[PDB]
Design a protein around this ligand. Structure first.
Ligand SMILES: [Fe+3]
Ligand SMILES: [Fe+3]
Ligand SMILES: [Fe+3]
Lengths: 269, 295
């Protein structure tokens, strides 16, 4: 009985709750399905006695995973969590619903990957379809998760002759004026927001600090959206999407100076 | 550094598990040392950060006033995944180095790139698992740069395929790897009541007590027969007997007191906190016993 085989067995039992109904209800030797492999059934036959402890090893695994659904929310989307707790959603009823679709998956230390799948799951829940302002706030939080995850092993671009867009900052074009909730976090999910698009820039001051939110002009959003690929050897001023063929100063240069301070772009040094 | 030795006796301390709850009843200056759960302060592995930036300022406040120990939970140290891939070397090893911790404890379970599946799975007591886990513990200690102790575990069923007892397993494990031991006395007391034939006396005689670096004194409860090791009840007297008995046979380096999680810690538990002196009088008793056997 190798230790690696008794672990693979329980990893299969904890993720398949159909197998849990067979083991708990039927304690007789051959009543539990002999579809368990011959090597598996030998390990189950050791647990023939003290099956109550097995029913206690589960639930504990499920109670911890349901609570981990809240940690992944507090880690990746603390504002979305505070808004959802204010509108009184049964996150326990949603933790069980989300984990069952994933076969009770143990995300482990992959908390941002956990949170990104959680925010995508809640974006389709019928309970949240009536709160578009929170649905907008969750997408903003989902970009914060993609900011951290994009910095694990990013493509290191050397400083050269063209304006480069750094990976320590992302941009989100909102649907509502989410600044009202960011400036007044006591109103998270409680008050009402207008339907005016904003340009919030999720960025990081240092690589070992909490990410920040800040608003930029539509012009600054044009400077950032035209740097998807670093085609910017003075062509950035030519790249106003044919709306303008002008190369300006101060009007456009001061915006690029602020974007570098926010670690959003890299100037040609 | 090439081979680590037991640090000098450093004193008694508290676990510092309740972040907001324990600093308010902080008493005098006699604590000197507290523990730090490395899992609470670690940042996600799918991100670029090692420590939670909120916990970065808290460690600065306490690293100056008190010595802060390391504790490795949910680290997947003794799993089957590659050691380089585990959360131990990726987050827990730099965290203990960032904390300037003298040594680091580590629970004795199983973990493969997943947390919350660690508990209720003691390592298979077999010479095959002794050789495998000692190779990992000896290499993991090299990366820590500090002594690595293993906390004894309390459970309800030993892993299927056990070829020896827990005391023989831990003795053969630290002898081959050269690591140390972290003696949780309430886990020893729990295994005595809830396991068929757990010789409490043979367990103490079999362990290399000169490998015990740290000691843990905690208290759990049970009512009807279901769950235990809640880490909440007052330190029971049979555990106090082991604390006085251990200090007469070996010389540890520190002793910490575990207590409950602030919310639940199990499927059904309580969170009321009006018996703060129940902990203060426990730290007073364990601190006076240390001076009775003080070197
Ligand atoms: Fe522990
Ligand atoms: Fe302990
Ligand atoms: Fe314990």
């Amino acid at each position: 009985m190798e230790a690696e085989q008794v672990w693979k067995l329980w990893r299969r039992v904890l993720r398949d709750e159909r197998l849990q109904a067979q083991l708990f209800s039927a304690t007789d030797a051959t009543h539990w399905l002999s579809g368990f492999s011959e090597s598996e059934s030998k390990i189950l036959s050791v647990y023939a006695q003290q099956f109550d402890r097995v029913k206690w090893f589960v639930e504990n695994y499920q109670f911890r995973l349901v609570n981990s659904f809240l940690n992944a929310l507090e880690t990746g989307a603390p504002l979305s969590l505070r808004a959802l707790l204010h509108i009184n959603v049964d996150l326990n009823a949603q933790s069980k619903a989300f984990l069952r679709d994933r076969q009770w998956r143990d995300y482990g230390p992959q908390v941002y990957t956990y949170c990104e799948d959680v925010l995508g799951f809640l974006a389709e829940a019928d309970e949240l379809q009536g709160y578009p302002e929170i649905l907008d706030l969750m997408r903003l939080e989902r970009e914060s998760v993609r900011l951290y995850r994009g910095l694990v092993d990013p493509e290191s671009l050397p400083a050269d002759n063209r304006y480069q867009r750094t990976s320590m900052a992302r941009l989100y074009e909102t649907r509502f004026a989410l600044s009202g909730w960011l400036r007044q976090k006591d109103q998270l999910g409680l008050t009402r927001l207008p339907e005016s698009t904003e340009h919030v820039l999720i960025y990081l001051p240092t690589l070992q600090a909490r990410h920040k939110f800040t608003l930029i002009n539509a012009q600054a959003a044009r400077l950032y959206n035209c740097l998807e690929q670093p085609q910017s050897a003075a062509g950035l001023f030519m790249l106003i999407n044919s709306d303008s063929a002008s190369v300006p100063g101060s009007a456009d240069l001061a915006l690029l100076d602020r974007l570098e301070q926010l670690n959003a772009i890299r100037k040609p040094l | 550094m090439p081979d680590f030795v037991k640090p000098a006796p450093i004193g008694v301390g508290i676990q510092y598990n309740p972040e907001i709850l324990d600093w308010f009843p902080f008493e005098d200056i006699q604590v000197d040392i507290l523990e730090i759960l490395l899992d609470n302060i670690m940042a996600p592995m799918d991100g670029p950060q090692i420590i939670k930036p909120s916990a970065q300022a808290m460690i600065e406040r306490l690293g100056q006033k008190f010595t802060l120990l390391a504790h490795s939970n949910y680290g997947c140290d003794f799993g089957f995944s590659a050691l380089e891939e585990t959360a131990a070397v990726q987050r827990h090893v730099p965290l203990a180095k960032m904390l300037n911790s003298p040594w680091v404890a580590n629970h004795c379970f199983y973990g493969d790139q997943s947390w919350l599946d660690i508990w209720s799975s003691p390592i298979q007591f077999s010479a095959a698992e002794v050789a495998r886990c000692a190779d990992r513990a000896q290499s993991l200690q090299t990366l820590y740069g500090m002594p690595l102790a293993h906390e004894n575990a309390a459970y309800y069923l030993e892993c299927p395929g056990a070829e020896m007892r827990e005391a023989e397993f831990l003795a053969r494990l630290v002898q081959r790897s050269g690591t140390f031991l972290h003696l949780d006395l309430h886990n020893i007391y729990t295994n005595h009541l809830n396991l068929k034939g757990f010789d409490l006396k043979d367990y103490m005689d079999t362990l290399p007590l000169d490998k015990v670096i740290s000691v843990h004194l905690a208290g759990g409860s049970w009512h009807g027969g279901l769950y235990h090791d809640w880490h909440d009840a007052c330190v029971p007297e049979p555990v106090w007997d082991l604390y006085e008995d251990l200090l007469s046979r070996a010389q540890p380096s520190a002793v910490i007191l575990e207590y409950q999680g602030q919310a639940h810690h199990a499927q059904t538990r309580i969170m009321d906190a009006s018996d703060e002196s129940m902990i203060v009088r426990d730290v007073q008793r364990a601190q006076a016993i240390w001076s009775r056997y003080n070197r």
